[PDB]
Design a protein around this nucleic acid. Sequence first.
RNA 1: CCCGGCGAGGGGAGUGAAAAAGAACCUGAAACCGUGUACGUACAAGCAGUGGGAGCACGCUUAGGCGUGUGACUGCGUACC
RNA 2: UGUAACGGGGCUAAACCAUGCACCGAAGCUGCGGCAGCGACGCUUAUGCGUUGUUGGGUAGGGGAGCGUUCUGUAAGCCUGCGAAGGUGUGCUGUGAGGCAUGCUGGAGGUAUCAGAAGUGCGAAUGCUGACAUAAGUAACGAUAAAGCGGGUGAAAAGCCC
Lengths: 150, 103, 48, 56, 142, 110, 117, 27
Amino acid sequence: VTGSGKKPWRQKGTGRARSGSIKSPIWRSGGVTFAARPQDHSQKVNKKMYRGALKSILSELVRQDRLIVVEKFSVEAPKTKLLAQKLKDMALEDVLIITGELDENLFLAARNLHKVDVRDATGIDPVSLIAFDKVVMTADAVKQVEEMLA
Amino acid sequence: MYAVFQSGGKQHRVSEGQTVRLEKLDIATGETVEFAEVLMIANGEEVKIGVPFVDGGVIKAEVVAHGRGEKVKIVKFRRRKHYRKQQGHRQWFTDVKITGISA
Amino acid sequence: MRLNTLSPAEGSKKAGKRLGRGIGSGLGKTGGRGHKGQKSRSGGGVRR
Amino acid sequence: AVQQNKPTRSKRGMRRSHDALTAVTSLSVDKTSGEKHLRHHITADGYYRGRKVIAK
Amino acid sequence: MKTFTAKPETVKRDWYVVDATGKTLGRLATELARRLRGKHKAEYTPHVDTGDYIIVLNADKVAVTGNKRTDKVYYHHTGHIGGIKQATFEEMIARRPERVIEIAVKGMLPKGPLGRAMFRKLKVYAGNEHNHAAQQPQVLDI
Amino acid sequence: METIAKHRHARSSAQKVRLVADLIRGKKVSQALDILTYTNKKAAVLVKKVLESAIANAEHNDGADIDDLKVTKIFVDEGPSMKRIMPRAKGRADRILKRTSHITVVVSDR
Amino acid sequence: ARVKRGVIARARHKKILKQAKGYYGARSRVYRVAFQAVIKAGQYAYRDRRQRKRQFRQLWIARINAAARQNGISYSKFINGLKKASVEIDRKILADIAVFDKVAFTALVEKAKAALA
Amino acid sequence: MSGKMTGIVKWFNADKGFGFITPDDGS
RNA sequence: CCCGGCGAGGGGAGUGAAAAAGAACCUGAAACCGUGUACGUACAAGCAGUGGGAGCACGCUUAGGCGUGUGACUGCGUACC
RNA sequence: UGUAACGGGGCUAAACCAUGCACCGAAGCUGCGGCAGCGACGCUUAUGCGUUGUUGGGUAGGGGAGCGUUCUGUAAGCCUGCGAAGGUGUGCUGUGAGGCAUGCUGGAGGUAUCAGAAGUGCGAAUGCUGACAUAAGUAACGAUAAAGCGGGUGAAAAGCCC
Ligand SMILES: [Mg+2]
Ligand SMILES: [Mg+2]
Ligand SMILES: [Mg+2]
Ligand SMILES: [Mg+2]
Ligand SMILES: [Mg+2]
Ligand SMILES: [Mg+2]
Ligand SMILES: [Mg+2]
Ligand SMILES: [Mg+2]
Ligand SMILES: [Mg+2]
Ligand SMILES: [Mg+2]
Ligand SMILES: [Mg+2]
Ligand SMILES: [Mg+2]
Ligand SMILES: [Mg+2]
Ligand SMILES: [Mg+2]
Ligand SMILES: [Mg+2]
Ligand SMILES: [Mg+2]
Ligand SMILES: [Mg+2]
Ligand SMILES: [Mg+2]
Ligand SMILES: [Mg+2]
Ligand SMILES: [Mg+2]
Ligand SMILES: [Mg+2]
Ligand SMILES: [Mg+2]
Ligand SMILES: [Mg+2]
Ligand SMILES: [Mg+2]
Ligand SMILES: [Mg+2]
Ligand SMILES: [Mg+2]
Ligand SMILES: [Mg+2]
Ligand SMILES: [Mg+2]
Ligand SMILES: [Mg+2]
Ligand SMILES: [Mg+2]
Ligand SMILES: [Mg+2]
Ligand SMILES: [Mg+2]
Ligand SMILES: [Mg+2]
Ligand SMILES: [Mg+2]
Ligand SMILES: [Mg+2]
Ligand SMILES: [Mg+2]
Ligand SMILES: [Mg+2]
Ligand SMILES: [Mg+2]
Ligand SMILES: [Mg+2]
Ligand SMILES: [Mg+2]
Ligand SMILES: [Mg+2]
Ligand SMILES: [Mg+2]
Ligand SMILES: [Mg+2]
Ligand SMILES: [Mg+2]
Ligand SMILES: [Mg+2]
């Protein structure tokens, strides 16, 4: 705290309480007693625990029928109107679309829709696999997920 | 006419047509209880005193309603000994209405 | 299985002590420290 | 020479029980000009018991 | 139900005349304070004056046992610093003999506004006569 | 029909003014004006100028005859206290309070 | 973060200050005094739930002793009569009959005297 | 109005006016 | 427009969704100070309450009596840290 | 300092001794109802369900289980100008921390559930800051060099001007 390290009054003789610093955390505009620092909240997850969780939640999405498997899922031109038409034909609104390739027209056509997210099969995460209502996997992306996860 | 009977560990002077709040019984809210152990029946200079209870006397009542009493707050406090407790309590009861004192 | 259906295991997460927040908590004014010692002082205690 | 407890507002009102003002009972009326004044005082215009005792 | 309480409006009180000739002081006075308290009535209530008006006569002819006629001492204090005073039984009988009965009953009554109201019903007279014939008082033997 | 007049931020103590305001509560205004005329307090000058304003507001703004008017409510509230520093001996300072008031006079028929 | 505690401390003080209605002075106005007065009232209430049962039994006994001595028997002779006659009427009901139905109390006294004789 | 200097350092007691009113009897 | 000192301040009128948004201006708690109404209080002694409890006032109601406020008198009772 | 060496009144028993029968008398015991803990036993446990005993004063201190607050996800969801939060009342409810509904004010935000993180709960620290009391409408109004009158101005003159 910007201040001075001088006693606001002497120790005794005056009728007031003892005080040593105006920077005291009991004063107005004093310090915070246990003032915080920039800290890192990242936790370690074991590799086998991360894969156990993914193999668990993909088993649960299968048992809950929240997993859709198609051979290919492409949009010809990078248009969100075309993607919204295709998802309306699939009866999908809130969906994660994992694809084993880099489709730029699909990324751009899915970038503006907040109900829709498009990932690579490598860039999948458990919180997305839970937060989305349906998950569409390319059969190749299934083959890649099965290969990473044995 | 009045009568005296035991219920809930305590006794009750009661005339016909009165509503008496008793301690909780295991009886539905419309059924009929019969208090056979009656202690005294007075009918206007026609008393009979149960030496251990009146023999032929019985009180026929209809259960009006069950319910819980008013909330009370129990405060325990040991001064300068860093101790207090709080506890509320509501006591179950059962209001009955006397259909008739069969002497 | 949603993000508002998950729950940890029983006994996994334990609450943790919060000293000096009332009589009923148990950890009252002194907080497991007794009265007027060296151990009750801030930073007090003897070395190994 | 100073208190040890704060005296209540009840005692404050009881001390102020006698501090009430007495309104003037009745204003005397001049017999000539008919205006009201204090008894045994002159009027504002300068009358007292009828006559004009001082011009103004 | 709830326990009956007497009510000061609906309560009835009666008048009694006691002759105090030859009777023991304290054994009279505890029956007087019993009947001023109202502990002889089934509608007794502690916070209600349920006792009876009592006229006590021949108060100067009350009897005490032992040497208490010359040895019982009535001390009191005037408030002033030397103000301890002292009077014997037969001096109180000569000076103002009603105080002896009044003090004994006042000591046997409860202390407070209700006990003072009970004491207001005690009406003592040194002689054998009273002006309270208008209240049609009954006799009482104690 | 009630008619209100107020002198807010009256530079006077509320305790000093309530002595005057208690003289004329419930009175007819011709008697209250005569009491305030021959009362020697400064608060009588204040509350008289307020009672005169309430009378003129009741006559102009509300249509009321003066002889039937009557002081039904009068009350003095505590105002903002401007505060000044008065020096005492040995360098000690005391913070005096310079009290204000809010005089309110309600005059009416009913 | 930074929990600001005005709402909670206000409602917590108002829970006490509502309980302190009727009290004299700062006991109904000031939280430091009211809380100190509410706790004493809970202590007295816990105590006087026990003392109610004493004081009414004492009242009942004094009324039975008066009505029995009106019928010419003491309390201690009358309870012993009702024990020997097995009459298990509690002395709430005996005080009620002694007030409202003096005939039945006379009959109880005569039962107790005949049980002793 | 710019009315500070009331209880700032209470110099009131920084005066620390001599105490010990000739009472060294409590020795 | 009016009272007022060609004041302060206020009452109208007017604006505005709102002036209990009027510049001392969002919401406006508490301490504190008032006005009004109900009850109690001038023979009465103490942590000021609690248990009982008359009476009074006010609402409901099928009168059943419940509530609400007050609290004469009375048992017990010497704050917190 | 005052009775002041039965608690008092008072007592010649209302004192003492002996015996006896009554009764009063505690939050003890019993009765009725309710909660919880720990053990038995059995079930067929939803891993807790009957019965069953028994236990339940408590500082330092140890252990177990919870309420509520702010923020993040759930939530581009839900509630909300047909009135949010907040403020003030009332009623109901829970063993408690608390909760719910609603009247009035207010006039725009709030947030279930299940998880997560804490600047997470104040009456005290001769605690800090601001506001308001008290004493109290009391003390004082600063050299005991001294004032009085007329006229004027002015809303008003002991204090201004002549
Ligand atoms: Mg230095
Ligand atoms: Mg800071
Ligand atoms: Mg790694
Ligand atoms: Mg300590
Ligand atoms: Mg030590
Ligand atoms: Mg230690
Ligand atoms: Mg340190
Ligand atoms: Mg002190
Ligand atoms: Mg005065
Ligand atoms: Mg006593
Ligand atoms: Mg209040
Ligand atoms: Mg103006
Ligand atoms: Mg706004
Ligand atoms: Mg505002
Ligand atoms: Mg307020
Ligand atoms: Mg009276
Ligand atoms: Mg009186
Ligand atoms: Mg006194
Ligand atoms: Mg009560
Ligand atoms: Mg002496
Ligand atoms: Mg013996
Ligand atoms: Mg008992
Ligand atoms: Mg027990
Ligand atoms: Mg049981
Ligand atoms: Mg325990
Ligand atoms: Mg126990
Ligand atoms: Mg402990
Ligand atoms: Mg949120
Ligand atoms: Mg509204
Ligand atoms: Mg918020
Ligand atoms: Mg609210
Ligand atoms: Mg609201
Ligand atoms: Mg904190
Ligand atoms: Mg605080
Ligand atoms: Mg503390
Ligand atoms: Mg403090
Ligand atoms: Mg302070
Ligand atoms: Mg001050
Ligand atoms: Mg003052
Ligand atoms: Mg003084
Ligand atoms: Mg003086
Ligand atoms: Mg002076
Ligand atoms: Mg001067
Ligand atoms: Mg002049
Ligand atoms: Mg001069």
